[PDB]
Amino acid sequence: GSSFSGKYQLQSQENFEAFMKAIGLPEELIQKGKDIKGVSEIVQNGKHFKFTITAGSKVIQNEFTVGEECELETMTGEKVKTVVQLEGDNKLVTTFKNIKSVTELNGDIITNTMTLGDIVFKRISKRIGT
Numbered sequence: 459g460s461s462f463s464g465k466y467q468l469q470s471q472e473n474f475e476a477f478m479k480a481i482g483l484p485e486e487l488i489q490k491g492k493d494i495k496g497v498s499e500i501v502q503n504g505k506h507f508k509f510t511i512t513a514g515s516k517v518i519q520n521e522f523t524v525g526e527e528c529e530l531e532t533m534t535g536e537k538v539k540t541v542v543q544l545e546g547d548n549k550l551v552t553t554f555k556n557i558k559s560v561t562e563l564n565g566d567i568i569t570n571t572m573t574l575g576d577i578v579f580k581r582i583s584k585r586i587g588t
Protein backbone atom coordinates (compact mmCIF):
# COMPACT_ATOMS: atom_id res chain seq x y z
CA GLY A 459 0.00 0.00 0.00
CA SER A 460 1.16 3.55 -0.85
CA SER A 461 -1.91 5.74 -0.23
CA PHE A 462 0.04 8.65 1.32
CA SER A 463 3.07 8.51 -1.01
CA GLY A 464 4.12 11.67 -2.86
CA LYS A 465 5.76 15.07 -3.01
CA TYR A 466 3.83 17.99 -1.51
CA GLN A 467 4.39 21.70 -0.89
CA LEU A 468 2.93 23.98 1.79
CA GLN A 469 0.27 26.33 0.39
CA SER A 470 -0.70 28.05 3.63
CA GLN A 471 -0.30 27.66 7.38
CA GLU A 472 -1.82 29.15 10.55
CA ASN A 473 -0.17 30.01 13.89
CA PHE A 474 3.36 29.04 12.80
CA GLU A 475 5.01 31.78 14.88
CA ALA A 476 3.00 31.18 18.08
CA PHE A 477 3.49 27.41 17.85
CA MET A 478 7.20 27.44 17.03
CA LYS A 479 7.84 29.81 19.95
CA ALA A 480 5.80 27.53 22.25
CA ILE A 481 7.89 24.45 21.38
CA GLY A 482 11.16 26.44 21.44
CA LEU A 483 12.36 26.82 17.84
CA PRO A 484 15.25 29.35 17.73
CA GLU A 485 13.92 32.84 16.99
CA GLU A 486 16.08 33.24 13.88
CA LEU A 487 14.61 30.00 12.49
CA ILE A 488 11.05 31.18 13.20
CA GLN A 489 11.85 34.37 11.26
CA LYS A 490 13.54 32.65 8.31
CA GLY A 491 11.01 29.79 8.26
CA LYS A 492 7.66 31.61 8.58
CA ASP A 493 7.25 32.38 4.86
CA ILE A 494 9.01 29.27 3.53
CA LYS A 495 6.68 27.07 1.49
CA GLY A 496 8.43 23.89 2.56
CA VAL A 497 8.39 20.62 0.63
CA SER A 498 7.36 17.30 2.16
CA GLU A 499 7.97 13.89 0.63
CA ILE A 500 6.30 10.71 1.86
CA VAL A 501 7.11 7.17 0.78
CA GLN A 502 4.63 4.60 2.09
CA ASN A 503 4.98 0.81 1.76
CA GLY A 504 1.99 -0.71 3.56
CA LYS A 505 2.50 0.10 7.25
CA HIS A 506 6.02 1.39 6.64
CA PHE A 507 6.43 5.13 6.13
CA LYS A 508 9.45 7.31 5.37
CA PHE A 509 9.05 11.07 5.17
CA THR A 510 11.24 14.10 4.50
CA ILE A 511 10.46 17.69 5.49
CA THR A 512 12.58 20.35 3.76
CA ALA A 513 12.65 24.06 4.66
CA GLY A 514 15.59 25.96 3.18
CA SER A 515 18.73 24.00 4.07
CA LYS A 516 16.97 22.25 6.98
CA VAL A 517 16.21 18.68 5.96
CA ILE A 518 14.59 16.31 8.46
CA GLN A 519 14.20 12.65 7.53
CA ASN A 520 11.97 10.42 9.65
CA GLU A 521 10.62 6.88 9.61
CA PHE A 522 7.96 4.79 11.34
CA THR A 523 5.81 1.70 11.10
CA VAL A 524 2.16 2.14 12.01
CA GLY A 525 1.55 0.59 15.44
CA GLU A 526 5.23 0.27 16.40
CA GLU A 527 7.44 2.48 18.55
CA CYS A 528 9.30 5.01 16.44
CA GLU A 529 11.63 7.90 17.17
CA LEU A 530 10.58 11.13 15.58
CA GLU A 531 12.98 13.98 15.07
CA THR A 532 11.07 17.22 15.50
CA MET A 533 11.78 20.73 14.13
CA THR A 534 14.01 21.69 17.11
CA GLY A 535 15.98 18.48 16.55
CA GLU A 536 14.45 16.88 19.65
CA LYS A 537 13.89 13.17 19.08
CA VAL A 538 10.78 11.76 20.74
CA LYS A 539 9.72 8.12 21.13
CA THR A 540 6.07 7.62 20.20
CA VAL A 541 3.66 5.56 18.08
CA VAL A 542 1.92 6.67 14.90
CA GLN A 543 -1.53 5.16 14.26
CA LEU A 544 -3.91 5.10 11.28
CA GLU A 545 -7.31 6.72 11.88
CA GLY A 546 -9.70 5.72 9.09
CA ASP A 547 -7.92 5.16 5.78
CA ASN A 548 -6.82 8.78 5.25
CA LYS A 549 -5.39 9.94 8.58
CA LEU A 550 -2.13 9.52 10.46
CA VAL A 551 -2.44 10.28 14.18
CA THR A 552 0.27 10.65 16.87
CA THR A 553 1.24 12.51 20.06
CA PHE A 554 4.78 13.76 20.80
CA LYS A 555 5.93 16.23 23.49
CA ASN A 556 2.22 16.80 24.32
CA ILE A 557 1.54 17.82 20.71
CA LYS A 558 -1.40 16.02 19.15
CA SER A 559 -0.77 15.63 15.41
CA VAL A 560 -3.33 14.73 12.73
CA THR A 561 -2.19 14.27 9.12
CA GLU A 562 -5.12 14.07 6.73
CA LEU A 563 -4.87 13.33 3.00
CA ASN A 564 -7.74 14.17 0.66
CA GLY A 565 -6.75 13.33 -2.93
CA ASP A 566 -3.85 15.71 -3.56
CA ILE A 567 -4.29 17.83 -0.44
CA ILE A 568 -2.63 17.00 2.89
CA THR A 569 -3.91 18.94 5.89
CA ASN A 570 -1.61 18.69 8.91
CA THR A 571 -2.81 19.96 12.27
CA MET A 572 -0.60 20.10 15.35
CA THR A 573 -2.26 21.02 18.63
CA LEU A 574 -0.33 21.99 21.75
CA GLY A 575 -2.76 23.08 24.47
CA ASP A 576 -4.90 25.86 22.93
CA ILE A 577 -2.49 26.40 20.00
CA VAL A 578 -3.57 24.82 16.71
CA PHE A 579 -0.83 24.86 14.06
CA LYS A 580 -2.52 24.07 10.76
CA ARG A 581 -0.74 23.42 7.46
CA ILE A 582 -2.35 22.85 4.09
CA SER A 583 -0.12 21.25 1.43
CA LYS A 584 -0.72 20.28 -2.18
CA ARG A 585 0.84 17.58 -4.40
CA ILE A 586 3.60 18.93 -6.69
CA GLY A 587 4.27 16.28 -9.31
CA THR A 588 5.82 12.85 -8.78
Ligand SMILES: CCCCCCCCCCCCCCCC(=O)O
Pocket residue numbers: 487488490491492494496511513514515516533570572581
Ligand atom coordinates in the same frame (compact mmCIF):
# COMPACT_ATOMS: atom_id res chain seq x y z
C1 LIG B 1 18.30 28.49 7.04
C2 LIG B 1 16.88 28.26 6.54
C3 LIG B 1 15.88 28.38 7.68
C4 LIG B 1 15.24 27.03 8.00
C5 LIG B 1 14.34 27.13 9.23
C6 LIG B 1 12.90 26.74 8.90
C7 LIG B 1 12.51 25.45 9.60
C8 LIG B 1 11.39 25.69 10.60
C9 LIG B 1 10.30 24.63 10.49
C10 LIG B 1 9.15 25.14 9.62
C11 LIG B 1 8.42 24.02 8.89
C12 LIG B 1 7.36 23.38 9.77
C13 LIG B 1 7.40 21.87 9.60
C14 LIG B 1 6.10 21.24 10.05
C15 LIG B 1 6.23 19.72 10.10
C16 LIG B 1 4.90 19.07 9.84
O1 LIG B 1 3.83 19.59 10.22
O2 LIG B 1 4.85 17.98 9.25
Ligand SMILES: CCCCCCCCCCCCCCCC(=O)O
Pocket residue numbers: 466497498500509511520530531532533542550551552559561568570581582583
Ligand atom coordinates in the same frame (compact mmCIF):
# COMPACT_ATOMS: atom_id res chain seq x y z
C1 LIG C 1 7.54 17.22 13.16
C2 LIG C 1 7.83 15.77 13.52
C3 LIG C 1 7.23 14.82 12.49
C4 LIG C 1 5.71 14.89 12.45
C5 LIG C 1 5.10 13.63 13.05
C6 LIG C 1 3.92 13.13 12.23
C7 LIG C 1 4.17 11.70 11.78
C8 LIG C 1 3.11 11.16 10.83
C9 LIG C 1 2.89 12.05 9.61
C10 LIG C 1 4.05 12.07 8.62
C11 LIG C 1 3.69 12.89 7.37
C12 LIG C 1 3.90 14.38 7.60
C13 LIG C 1 3.67 15.20 6.33
C14 LIG C 1 3.07 16.55 6.70
C15 LIG C 1 2.90 17.49 5.52
C16 LIG C 1 3.38 18.86 5.93
O1 LIG C 1 2.62 19.63 6.55
O2 LIG C 1 4.54 19.24 5.66
